[PDB]
Ligand binder design. Structure first.
Ligand SMILES: *[C@@H]1O[C@H](CO[C@@H]2O[C@@H](C)[C@@H](O)[C@@H](O)[C@@H]2O)[C@@H](O[C@@H]2O[C@H](CO)[C@@H](O[C@@H]3O[C@H](CO[C@H]4O[C@H](CO)[C@@H](O)[C@H](O)[C@@H]4O)[C@@H](O)[C@H](O)[C@@H]3O)[C@H](O)[C@H]2NC(C)=O)[C@H](O)[C@H]1NC(C)=O
Ligand SMILES: *[C@@H]1O[C@H](CO)[C@@H](O[C@@H]2O[C@H](CO)[C@@H](O[C@@H]3O[C@H](CO)[C@@H](O)[C@H](O[C@H]4O[C@H](CO)[C@@H](O)[C@H](O)[C@@H]4O)[C@@H]3O)[C@H](O)[C@H]2NC(C)=O)[C@H](O)[C@H]1NC(C)=O
Ligand SMILES: *[C@@H]1O[C@H](CO)[C@@H](O[C@@H]2O[C@H](CO)[C@@H](O[C@@H]3O[C@H](CO[C@H]4O[C@H](CO)[C@@H](O)[C@H](O)[C@@H]4O)[C@@H](O)[C@H](O)[C@@H]3O)[C@H](O)[C@H]2NC(C)=O)[C@H](O)[C@H]1NC(C)=O
Ligand SMILES: *[C@@H]1O[C@H](CO)[C@@H](O[C@@H]2O[C@H](CO)[C@@H](O[C@@H]3O[C@H](CO[C@H]4O[C@H](CO)[C@@H](O)[C@H](O)[C@@H]4O)[C@@H](O)[C@H](O)[C@@H]3O)[C@H](O)[C@H]2NC(C)=O)[C@H](O)[C@H]1NC(C)=O
Ligand SMILES: *[C@@H]1O[C@H](CO)[C@@H](O[C@@H]2O[C@H](CO)[C@@H](O[C@@H]3O[C@H](CO)[C@@H](O)[C@H](O)[C@@H]3O)[C@H](O)[C@H]2NC(C)=O)[C@H](O)[C@H]1NC(C)=O
Ligand SMILES: *[C@@H]1O[C@H](CO)[C@@H](O[C@@H]2O[C@H](CO)[C@@H](O)[C@H](O)[C@H]2NC(C)=O)[C@H](O)[C@H]1NC(C)=O
Ligand SMILES: *[C@@H]1O[C@H](CO)[C@@H](O[C@@H]2O[C@H](CO)[C@@H](O)[C@H](O)[C@H]2NC(C)=O)[C@H](O)[C@H]1NC(C)=O
Ligand SMILES: *[C@@H]1O[C@H](CO)[C@@H](O)[C@H](O)[C@H]1NC(C)=O
Ligand SMILES: *[C@@H]1O[C@H](CO)[C@@H](O)[C@H](O)[C@H]1NC(C)=O
Ligand SMILES: [Cl-]
Ligand code: NI
Length: 1270
């Protein structure tokens, strides 16, 4: 099975001749056995070059070549998919851009597969990437590294160290030189110390002058010091001991004072273990150097740092490198680590050499899986480009101060077999077009539709520190990419080029640190986009937001592609970008689309993660300018064009039915702008969680009529979070930090500190927000945070069909909805869209009114006297029927429309139009059905106007009164406007009447009344045909009315001086009010309690509530919540829950509560009463003195009998069994302070627990993997 175990292989050894060219032709079945340096290698005519492997994995081979050119049946094998390569091989691609000559199709520094070429590489199978099963605070410690040093801190400097957490509890300086009162506060300091607290001391300047014998006795007693009895003048001394630890828990030293020097330091150092197995050393010192008396401490991690992971990583080896991602807004918080030899590590742990500088989440935070991804980079098959210490030549050096010209791999069409697996690709790619670390160029169908038995696959590579892209797909369908890692590369990491690439499946792939590039406009950052005008027209200055700044980790230029189990852990702009090309571009720019892209239904999208990005997590909009730079459109070719309207239909056929695009199990957090932006017709986002984003989710469509007739936009079974317990880390270019909304803690923020954080944004529509839950949305005095809101600075449409249903709000959600105010982010808040903000509360889950509509407070076109003023939301709650009217005006530009309802004439609405850049500006206010309005202008009357009835049911109607000069003839026509072909069908004319009263009798007749006194052209707008679903227009078209005026009066057509109070009617109520219902519905919210990226493993949400003294007086109980079960208890004592770890849903086998009296009986029950393999949940309440259980916690998980002590409450989660999980934890506190509200997540049905495998765990992801294969 092995390719090197081929007997026909000759052993090869060419030498070190950088000018020796090599050609492997027919019969040349060579087996490389030693390091080599040749100019080139060309494998052709059936030649074979296999790397020689060993049964043990020791033969380190390093090839070095200007290039390798595989073609015409030639083969290059480094192991086989069945008999994999075991030693460490390396192919170094060298040669500068301007050194020697270059190839025609290829550049230099490459490995190039051609037609019929065989490139077969298969490295050592390792584990690609998993998640942190435990968090990792900076500097390796739970509460961080302490370093201190100061000159002339005279006296006895003291520090206390929590023996379980290595936290600095107290820091004090007792001037036992001058003041005898100080040697007295020092002795009383050591009397009230908890036993077992690590203590360190260091003489500052000169102690031993006012020091008392009662204190020197206390030091010898509490800490086991043998030398304190004889401290002297200007004598340095440092100690590190354990309170009540006897003499053997102590380590001390001393130095004399001679010739103004101590001849060296006086160091005291011991090692301890956190209760988490992490080792740390407490260090203290005091010395004299030529006169200075320094004194310092250092509490730091020692013997490497032990990391916790989700899955088994036994395949990782010392001397290999890994990477831990950012769990904060700045992607530059990802870090590199080198694996230490660890004999004491389990299957879910390794040891890293370095000290972490940042914070990396390893827990599920408030139901959102914020665990940091962790991936291995070192392989045994390496293909690397040779680079320089700094930039050179015209390799884009004004932007990069380093070499950006490495190697690249390139595979042409009609090849034989490409199968790359477990290969390391360092310093690959060039800043030249087509030169990418793995470049599949125009290969066509490469699966069962192209003729490949083994579909061409890329399995678990490692492409890091590359100079352009990571893997590029150039006009290739059906490719597979699996378990691959792309780190610190330029331009879009994973790249779908021309927008024709379909059937490609991306499974469980990871991408970090996607930095700006210089290739495409979309790849450039703000500085590069304003510089490279070499491809723009004339003196045009490119705009860096509308044409560039589109750096994405996953660039999907076509939707028919399957994205599963991936994770975009950081990017300069976006994490996953789905976009659409109007017609094929690039080198594929030519063949006609037989299925235009923005009509093709989305492939699979299931269980993805996106975080650490500045512009978006998942983005679905925009296109590429499919035209070169010209005089009518000077934008660069392939820049960003916001004129793409997704609208998926069957077979990409707009005459055929709609096909919804499913966004499933998206997890997205710590994004600076949007968590997800999705536009078009028929999109359903479900089972998704959004957290710590500036805006959680936004649904778009079009600004006038929807991009696809009948466009529903659903979000169901989702979860939103505002400011979770992921306080982030103020570092790694984290540009924003502020005050939390709830706890008012220092945390990192997405944008400026006054940005109103938002959960869901309403825009365009029609949008169905259902069965979703919002948590932790509190505003600060700076910003107006809210759960549900609207898009800022909106001027377009908003429909009253946007309904929010079955939504649940958390206890820390103070502002359910908000409509904006004049401020820094809303500006006027006075544009055409801001004024017409509205949604529909179907069931009464948002406002407490079954079937009620909500809009902005000062919008008087929707108000009847039964409404409820709401000032906090800046809104108003009412009920009725509502639609919209679109008013197009010609002949007059920059015109501002003023429309008023008769019933509230003192409250008109001045609109400013929609096309203040085009020639046909329309105005789109929202109205209440079966009412009368009037319209007036800030200028002369338009000679032609169209009235569209949008969202009208049959027989729904309003009366309208247009202001015209007293001197006008009219000609009014109705018709059905067919959206498809611009034709007007079934046209009817209007006939005048004598009075407003005669037209009222003829309400369903095509009649109009003109009041020459006021100038009002009255008529009735009534719909004849029916609607269907959510389409804005009727069955037989978009009903519209056309009014052709004939006048020469240039006067401001504003009749309100004359129209009222002549046509005033007393305000009435068509649809009356219900009553409130503060008390949530049964069913409100999302069914799922926790959203993880391993949906197959069931996670048990557990939540505690241990009040304090002011709350125990006020009566608040102590509660242990399990999946939503409040096991309440208020007696002073202990509540112990025994949960079966194999039951899903959980089966709690025993609940027990121990009073303060029978506290002594918990010793016994813990020793025996706990069934084997049983999850222990335990929380106390009140002053519990002497809990002789400090030692009884270790078999359940702990490392050493930690010290709760005193009378403080405690909370513990453990396991009675052989295994010792990573989630086991403990929370101690002083009495009366309590523990507040914490939240843990316990996985269930793990084979570590000792549970049987009832059935095979239904991995829904892998089912989508085998379905999309064939
Ligand atoms: C329908 O009725 C309106 C209203 O006319 C009313 O009744 C008469 C009796 C007068 O009292 C008016 O003041 C009332 O408002 C008519 O509008 C006015 O029409 C008259 C006659 O056409 C206009 O008087 C002229 O105005 C000229 C100014 O406009 C000219 O100059 C500009 C300058 O650029 C030029 O661009 C434009 O094309 C015009 O040619 C003025 O030069 C001239 O000497 C004469 O006085 C009066 O100005 C009109 N009002 C306004 C606001 O313009 C309508 O004309 C009438 N319909 C039709 C079809 O005629
Ligand atoms: C804007 O300018 C860019 C250049 O900066 C320009 O891109 C060029 O487009 C042409 C499109 O024809 C590309 O030419 C192709 O070259 C490949 C091989 O290199 C050929 O195989 C292609 O022909 C195939 O397609 C035909 C149609 O089916 C078949 O009949 C034929 O037999 C072949 O199968 C094609 O000739 C050219 O490579 C690019 N160049 C670059 C640098 O991208 C772009 O077209 C300009 N914009 C517009 C709108 O034209
Ligand atoms: C633009 O596209 C629109 C949508 O395709 C066109 O809309 C029109 O919509 C009406 C609906 O009110 C269609 O009415 C159809 O009526 C036929 C009945 O005719 C049948 O019988 C006669 C024999 O008497 C036969 O000659 C016909 O071919 C039919 O077989 C029904 O079968 C339909 O279900 C439907 O009710 C119109 O047909 C339809 N127009 C067309 C051209 O189909 C709009 O007309 C288009 N405008 C332009 C300018 O092309
Ligand atoms: C914690 O509490 C949660 C409360 O929501 C639990 O989550 C849900 O628990 C219910 C328990 O009834 C599960 O319902 C199961 O559904 C599966 C699958 O059938 C589904 O599909 C069919 C149609 O094919 C439909 O008719 C069913 O109603 C289901 O919707 C069945 O095999 C079971 O018999 C049972 O009906 C939910 O599926 C589950 N929600 C999920 C998994 O998202 C949770 O289990 C509790 N325990 C934990 C988290 O450990
Ligand atoms: C490790 O993670 C923890 C948890 O987020 C971080 O702990 C926080 O550290 C800050 C230090 O600036 C504490 O602020 C101060 O705490 C003292 C002691 O109670 C208090 O008297 C001050 O008023 C101030 O609040 C903060 O309390 C603490 N978190 C909590 C919940 O108390 C820590 O910063 C992370 N990193 C390291 C290196 O420890
Ligand atoms: C790749 O090679 C195949 C095989 O030669 C080409 O497929 C065609 O296969 C049919 C089978 O009946 C032959 O009759 C044709 O002569 C083959 N060639 C052509 C041009 O049709 C295929 O065209 C090749 N593709 C490329 C891009 O070279
Ligand atoms: C938003 O509300 C509209 C109107 O209330 C809903 O449209 C109704 O849908 C039902 C189907 O369940 C139809 O039977 C009714 O005829 C529709 N019109 C009504 C009640 O006036 C719509 O389903 C809601 N959701 C969306 C996304 O539009
Ligand atoms: C309700 O709010 C509007 C908005 O300004 C205000 O004009 C009106 O007086 C208020 N009425 C009541 C009864 O609060
Ligand atoms: C429990 O521990 C305390 C230590 O504070 C000790 O005094 C007491 O005697 C212990 N309990 C029993 C029953 O000995
Ligand atoms: Cl209970
Ligand atoms: Ni290519």
């Amino acid at each position: 099975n092995c390719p090197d175990q081929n007997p026909r292989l000759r052993n090869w050894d060419p030498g070190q001749d950088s000018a020796k060219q090599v050609v492997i032709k027919e019969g040349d079945m060579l087996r490389l056995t030693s390091d080599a340096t040749v100019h080139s290698i060309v494998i052709q005519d059936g030649g074979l070059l296999v790397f020689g492997d060993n049964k043990d994995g020791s033969r380190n081979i390093t090839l070095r070549t200007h290039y390798i050119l595989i073609q015409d049946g030639g083969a290059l094998h480094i192991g086989a998919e069945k008999c994999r390569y075991k030693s460490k091989a390396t192919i170094t691609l060298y040669g500068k851009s301007d050194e020697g000559e270059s190839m025609p199709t290829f550049g230099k520094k490459f490995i190039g597969v051609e037609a019929g070429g065989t490139l077969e590489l298969h490295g050592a199978r390792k584990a690609s990437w998993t998640l942190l099963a435990r968090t990792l605070n900076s500097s390796g410690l739970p509460f961080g590294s302490y370093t201190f040093e100061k000159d002339f801190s005279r006296g006895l400097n003291v520090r206390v160290i929590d023996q379980d957490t290595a936290k600095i509890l107290e820091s004090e300086r007792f001037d036992t030189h001058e003041y005898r009162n100080e040697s007295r506060r020092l002795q009383e300091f050591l009397r009230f110390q908890d036993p077992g607290r690590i203590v360190a001391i260091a003489v500052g300047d000169s102690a031993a002058k006012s020091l008392l014998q009662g204190t020197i006795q206390m030091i010898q007693e509490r800490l086991g010091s043998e030398l304190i009895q004889g401290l002297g003048y200007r004598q340095a001394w440092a100690l590190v001991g354990v309170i009540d630890g006897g003499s053997t828990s102590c380590n001390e030293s001393v130095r004399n004072y001679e010739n103004h020097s101590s001849g060296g330091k006086a160091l005291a150092q011991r090692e301890f273990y956190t209760v988490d197995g992490q080792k740390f050393s407490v260090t203290a010192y005091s010395e004299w150097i030529e006169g200075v008396s320094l004194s310092g401490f250092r509490v730091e991690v020692v013997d490497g740092v032990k990391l916790n992971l989700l899955d088994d990583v036994s395949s990782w080896k010392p001397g290999d490198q890994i990477v831990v991602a950012s769990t904060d807004y700045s992607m530059y918080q990802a870090e590199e680590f080198t694996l230490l030899p660890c004999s004491e590590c389990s299957h879910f742990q390794v040891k890293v050499k370095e000290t972490p500088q940042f914070l990396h989440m390893g827990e599920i935070i408030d139901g959102v899986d914020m665990r940091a991804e962790v991936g291995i980079l070192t392989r045994n098959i390496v293909i690397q480009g040779e680079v320089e210490d700094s930039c050179y030549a015209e390799n884009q050096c004004q932007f990069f101060d380093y070499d950006t010209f490495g190697g690249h791999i390139m595979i042409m069409k009609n090849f034989t077999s490409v199968h790359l697996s477990y290969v390391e690709l360092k310093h690959m790619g060039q800043q030249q077009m087509g030169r990418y670390p793995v470049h599949f160029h125009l290969c066509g169908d490469v699966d069962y539709k192209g003729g490949y038995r083994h579909a061409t696959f890329v399995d678990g590579l490692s492409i890091h520190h590359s100079f352009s892209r990571c893997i590029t797909v150039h006009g290739t369908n059906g490719l597979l990419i699996k378990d691959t890692i792309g780190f610190d590369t330029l331009g879009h990491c994973f790249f779908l080029e021309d927008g024709i690439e379909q059937r490609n499946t991306l499974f469980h792939n990871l991408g970090l640190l996607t930095k700006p590039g210089t290739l495409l406009p979309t790849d450039r950052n703000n500085s590069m986009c304003t510089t490279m005008r070499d491809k723009v027209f004339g003196n045009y200055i490119p705009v860096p937001a509308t044409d560039c700044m589109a750096v994405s980790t996953f660039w999907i230029a076509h939707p028919n592609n399957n994205l599963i189990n991936n994770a975009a852990a950081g990017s300069q702009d976006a994490g996953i970008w789905y976009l659409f090309h109007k017609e094929p571009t690039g080198e594929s720019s030519g063949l006609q689309l037989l299925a235009k892209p923005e009509l093709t239904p989305l492939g699979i999208f299931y269980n993805n993660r996106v975080h650490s990005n500045f512009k978006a997590g998942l983005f679905i909009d925009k296109g590429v300018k499919t035209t070169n730079s010209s005089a009518a459109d000077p934008r660069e070719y392939l820049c960003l064009d916001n004129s793409a309207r997704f609208r998926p239909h069957q077979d990409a056929n707009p005459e055929k039915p709609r096909v919804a695009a499913l966004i499933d199990r998206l997890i997205a957090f710590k994004n600076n702008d949007n968590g997800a932006w999705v536009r078009g017709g028929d999109i359903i986002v479900q089972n998704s969680a959004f957290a710590d984003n500036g805006i959680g989710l936004t649904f778009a469509s079009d600004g006038s009529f929807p991009s696809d007739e009948g466009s529903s936009q659903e979000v169901s079974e989702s979860l939103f979070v505002g400011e979770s317990r992921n306080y982030g880390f103020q570092g790694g270019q984290n540009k924003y930090v502020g005050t939390g909304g709830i706890d008012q803690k220092p945390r990192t923020l997405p944008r400026n500190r006054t940005f109103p954080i938002r959960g869901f944004q309403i825009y365009d529509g029609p949008i169905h927000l259902t069965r979703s839950t919002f948590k932790k949305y509190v505003p600060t005095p700076d910003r107006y945070s809210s759960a549900i809101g609207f898009l800022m600075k909106n001027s377009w449409q908003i429909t009253p069909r946007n309904n929010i249903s079955l939504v649940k709000f958390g206890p820390h959600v103070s502002l359910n909805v908000f409509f904006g105010k004049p401020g820094p982010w809303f500006e006027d808040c006075e544009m055409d869209g801001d004024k017409n903000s509205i949604f529909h509360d179907i069931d009464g889950s948002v406002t407490g009114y079954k079937d009620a509509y909500v809009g902005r407070m000062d919008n008087y076109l929707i108000r009847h006297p039964s409404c409820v003023n709401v000032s906090k939301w800046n809104a108003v709650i009412c009920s009725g029927t509502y639609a919209q009217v679109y008013v197009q005006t010609w002949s007059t530009q920059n015109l501002s429309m003023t429309i008023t309802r008769d019933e509230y004439p003192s409250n008109p609405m001045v609109l400013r139009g929609i096309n203040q850049k085009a020639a046909f500006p329309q105005y789109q206010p929202v109205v209440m059905l079966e009412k009368g309005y009037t319209i007036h202008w800030n200028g002369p009357a338009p000679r032609t106007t169209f009235l569209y009835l949008v969202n009208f049911n049959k027989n729904d109607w309003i009366r309208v009164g247009l202001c015209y000069p007293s001197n006008t003839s009219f000609q009014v026509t109705f018709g059905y406007l067919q959206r498809q072909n611009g034709s007007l069908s079934k046209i009817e004319e209007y006939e005048p009447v004598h009075s407003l009263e005669e037209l009222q009798r003829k309400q369903s007749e095509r009649k109009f009344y003109f009041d020459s006194s006021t100038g009002l052209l009255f008529l009735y707008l009534k719909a004849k045909s029916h609607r269907h679903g959510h389409s804005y227009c009727s069955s037989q078209g978009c009903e519209r009315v056309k009014i052709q005026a004939a006048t020469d009066s240039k006067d401001i057509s504003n009749c309100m001086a004359k129209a009222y109070p002549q046509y005033y009617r007393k305000p009435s109520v068509v649809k009356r009010m219900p009553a409130m219902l503060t008390g949530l519905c049964q069913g409100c919210g999302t069914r799922q309690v926790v959203f993880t990226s391993d949906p197959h493993k069931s996670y048990l949400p557990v939540q505690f509530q241990s009040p304090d003294k002011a709350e125990t007086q006020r009566g608040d109980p102590s509660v242990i919540s399990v999946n939503g079960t409040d096991f309440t208890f208020r007696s002073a004592g202990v509540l112990l829950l025994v949960v079966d770890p194999c039951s899903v849903p959980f089966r709690l086998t025993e609940k027990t509560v121990f009073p303060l009296a029978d506290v002594s009986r918990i010793e016994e029950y813990l020793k025996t009463g706990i069934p084997p393999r049983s999850i222990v949940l335990l929380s106390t309440r009140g002053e519990i003195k002497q809990l002789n259980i400090s030692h009884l916690l270790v078999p359940l998980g702990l490392a050493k009998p930690a010290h709760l002590y005193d009378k403080g409450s405690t909370i513990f989660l453990g396991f009675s069994g052989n295994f010792k999980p990573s989630w086991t934890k403990l929370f101690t506190s002083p009495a009366g302070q309590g523990l507040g509200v914490l939240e843990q997540f316990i996985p269930l049905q793990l084979d570590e627990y000792g549970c049987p495998r009832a059935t095979t765990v239904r991995r829904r992801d892998l089912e989508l993997l085998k379905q999309a294969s064939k």
